[PDB]
């Protein structure tokens, strides 16, 4: 106190990074919930399931990279409860994809606020870290999810009987 | 009489194993009937056919493993007639899948009764045999069949013209 | 009704093919019974066992090929109960081999009657099918079984202590 | 309601499986916390860190396997908040290893209670599942952790300056 | 005292495991005695010898696996004298095979009693351990030995001059 | 009686070889006891454990080679009980190594007495056998154990906290 490594690292930045770690862990848990929704016997869309499981693991990688940043900069990780997701029953392939898009946008908004704080505190290491590993990948995620929602809507999901089935097998497969 | 190998093997267990052999053979025959239904010129769903043929051969393996158990434990195999299946015309892909699910549940109920008898007779070898090779594989079968029924129902089988065709080619293919 | 494929296919032929399917399934079951007789702890002739198990699976292939014929020609498969074999205890290697020879001759007689019916109905496709895949293989089976019975008799089976043991290990091995 | 797959699956078992999923997720989070403790600049035991990170990921696999069980049996996954770990600062290599041992014993106690419930409800599938994938691996974990605690204590951790360093490099390396 | 690893491990179970270790070591020694009987100049059945030597080493593996279990569960191994086998002269191939069958049945009875104790003490880890590694392999051993005794008896051992010689070379070879 | 192979083989030599077989078996059992001491949760020196297990198996090879000698020369193996080791708790790495050194010296003394008897009976085959396979390997064993005791003593075992740990990992590893 301070860490022998710490330099140009504002306590506000340290706290905002702890908040972002919790949000990334929360996103992981939402996607895990979605993944196991799709392997229910009364849903059975295995490629939706694999899709969301892959998203869940990516979100864990995002959290861990922020944990490593906290250690590298000499901050102290403070973990909080990971809240359960808003739903256990995600209703349909389309509904899950829309919820995921909203979640990604919300996480993006949090990262942009983190970048604005980093800029305000004159922390270019932290600004570069967010630009290099977070902002770019959030834009790509939001765009992929938007594509998926569009196709599902057009195909007539969730009511058209063939739509989620064909999308599972041809886009997510 | 007794076999020089026989030990801790109740005559009731021996008889219940003979009953289970007949039931597994019967399941084999039901699936064989289903397999050749699907290769009729007026049905022509070749991947449904291959699916059920594969199930038929698995059921024979289940029967033979119980026959080997009877020999290993010093019991005497007693074969009975294998009754013909309830239908020759299985009506549709969905109807066959629903019949198969009911059959698997009925076989599962028989295996659970066998396990309860084995437990009542303090035969842990026989309990372990059922747990190791039967109970797990029945749960997986029932869950796969449930998935298949769900997708076919959702896709609009049997009346929707594309449903069984697309399921044949994309799930069972 | 009729099938759009059906041509030059007499209802009598269709019914006789259904009878032959049942007989081939029955032969399969007789050989399965024999196979598991030989792996009893008080018989223990593992190569007799493998021999009969191989015969059992061949008989299933014979049945399925007739089922496929029924579908190809536009007939409708009608399955019946598969009767249990005449014995559970097949007494000796020699006795089983003699029973198998009698069974093969009985199946051969049924196939020859099927060929005579096919000829009477001017169905050369069906005559050729039987000649190509059945008649030749039945002659070879009957001759192999006759060879086996001869050697076992000469060696002094079933009473000579070394005969079935040595035949198991040197002919069937 | 009920699921078309559900059979011999007691609502009490379904609820106890949901509780176990939460506990396995909690164990994952405790080990993640431990992993990033060890990569602090003022702790810097990289092999302790890798050790606990590996434990964290194993605990996630345990949770997911129970989620899959819930789906296979026709139960409905109900997720709850994942509570934060008891400490952010785990004090020493030895202290973390002692906390992990206590955690593993607590999880083991929960699994044994689950097995007793499964037995009481005559669910042998569920009993076998726990025996096959959980009970054995918990015993091995507890024994490994006990070995580690013993060696660290004997070597004079945490006060002896070389102990955690040498253990990091020679046992965990 | 107690071990830091010990959990749900009854002192009665610990003592019964020590008794089983001694019995497995004793079985090893009986088979070692048998192995070197068969390589006497006045017996000279080298494949009987290799057979029993292989059995001896398997029995040591069984003992060591129970020793490892004792350590894993936090019990304390207590070794006792290994009694010498009942005979130094095992009389014939058939007589040794009959003695081995009796020994295997006696060990099986001891394992079944251990399982009943484990069940009575609500130790499912210990029940699963016995089912997974012991009960199955004892049934297979007893059945193999029964097969061997049957063939030797039928062939006319021990008085028929060719019987043990031919069995040595064709079954055990 | 005598064996048709027996020549220049004194009954005293035959009896002393039986005594040596028992002693080698006893040494095997002492080392087995030591091996499983080191894998206790409260000892946990896995390389000490592997070391002693390797010694145990070597001692069995020594016993079997003497059994083969007895058969080759036309003597008759007479087995006796294998006494349990003097301790179940071997106290420390150093204490076990000192006990092993004493055991090896005691076995060496027995082999030297056997050689003196062989010489007195003018049995050069037996003298050469002991020189070729026993005396040389005992000297090497005693010297290795002496080296190990020296290093452990110098390093400050058993009280110095790092000594047995470092020796486990660097000498025995
Ligand atoms: Cl021969
Ligand atoms: Fe992604
Ligand atoms: Fe990634
Ligand atoms: Fe990725
Ligand atoms: Fe993220
Ligand atoms: Fe809440
Ligand atoms: Fe994301
Ligand atoms: Fe910038
Ligand atoms: Fe299957
Ligand atoms: Fe299979
Ligand atoms: Fe399969
Ligand atoms: Fe089955
Ligand atoms: Fe009927
Ligand atoms: Fe089945
Ligand atoms: Fe059980
Ligand atoms: Fe099991
Ligand atoms: Fe397609
Ligand atoms: Fe054949
Ligand atoms: Fe064939
Ligand atoms: Fe063939
Ligand atoms: Fe045939
Ligand atoms: Fe009948
Ligand atoms: Fe035939
Ligand atoms: Fe022809
Ligand atoms: Fe682990
Ligand atoms: Fe794993
Ligand atoms: Fe692992
Ligand atoms: Fe776990
Ligand atoms: Fe809290
Ligand atoms: Fe764990
Ligand atoms: Fe064996
Ligand atoms: Fe083995
Ligand atoms: Fe083996
Ligand atoms: Fe054993
Ligand atoms: Fe005695
Ligand atoms: Fe055994
Ligand atoms: Fe050595
Ligand atoms: Fe050696
Ligand atoms: Fe060696
Ligand atoms: Fe030795
Ligand atoms: Fe004593
Ligand atoms: Fe030695």
From Swiss-Prot, chains A, B, C, D, E, F:
<dbReference type="GO" id="GO:0005739">
    <property type="term" value="C:mitochondrion"/>
</dbReference>
<feature type="binding site">
    <location>
        <position position="59"/>
    </location>
    <ligand>
        <name>Fe cation 1</name>
    </ligand>
</feature>
<dbReference type="GO" id="GO:0008199">
    <property type="term" value="F:ferric iron binding"/>
</dbReference>
<dbReference type="GO" id="GO:0005634">
    <property type="term" value="C:nucleus"/>
</dbReference>
<feature type="binding site">
    <location>
        <position position="138"/>
    </location>
    <ligand>
        <name>Fe cation 2</name>
    </ligand>
</feature>
<dbReference type="GO" id="GO:0005759">
    <property type="term" value="C:mitochondrial matrix"/>
</dbReference>
<keyword id="KW-0479">Metal-binding</keyword>
<dbReference type="GO" id="GO:0008198">
    <property type="term" value="F:ferrous iron binding"/>
</dbReference>
<feature type="binding site">
    <location>
        <position position="24"/>
    </location>
    <ligand>
        <name>Fe cation 1</name>
    </ligand>
</feature>
<keyword id="KW-0809">Transit peptide</keyword>
<dbReference type="GO" id="GO:0006826">
    <property type="term" value="P:iron ion transport"/>
</dbReference>
<feature type="domain" description="Ferritin-like diiron">
    <location>
        <begin position="7"/>
        <end position="156"/>
    </location>
</feature>
<dbReference type="GO" id="GO:0005737">
    <property type="term" value="C:cytoplasm"/>
</dbReference>
<comment type="similarity">
    <text>Belongs to the ferritin family.</text>
</comment>
<comment type="subunit">
    <text>Homooligomer of 24 subunits. The functional molecule is roughly spherical and contains a central cavity into which the polymeric mineral iron core is deposited.</text>
</comment>
<feature type="binding site">
    <location>
        <position position="62"/>
    </location>
    <ligand>
        <name>Fe cation 1</name>
    </ligand>
</feature>
<dbReference type="GO" id="GO:0004322">
    <property type="term" value="F:ferroxidase activity"/>
</dbReference>
<keyword id="KW-0496">Mitochondrion</keyword>
<dbReference type="GO" id="GO:0005506">
    <property type="term" value="F:iron ion binding"/>
</dbReference>
<dbReference type="GO" id="GO:0051604">
    <property type="term" value="P:protein maturation"/>
</dbReference>
<feature type="binding site">
    <location>
        <position position="104"/>
    </location>
    <ligand>
        <name>Fe cation 2</name>
    </ligand>
</feature>
<keyword id="KW-0560">Oxidoreductase</keyword>
<keyword id="KW-0409">Iron storage</keyword>
<comment type="function">
    <text>Catalyzes the oxidation of ferrous iron(II) to ferric iron(III) and stores iron in a soluble, non-toxic, readily available form. Important for iron homeostasis. Iron is taken up in the ferrous form and deposited as ferric hydroxides after oxidation.</text>
</comment>
<keyword id="KW-0408">Iron</keyword>
<dbReference type="GO" id="GO:0006879">
    <property type="term" value="P:intracellular iron ion homeostasis"/>
</dbReference>
<feature type="binding site">
    <location>
        <position position="59"/>
    </location>
    <ligand>
        <name>Fe cation 2</name>
    </ligand>
</feature>
<protein>
    <recommendedName>
        <fullName>Ferritin, mitochondrial</fullName>
        <ecNumber>1.16.3.1</ecNumber>
    </recommendedName>
</protein>
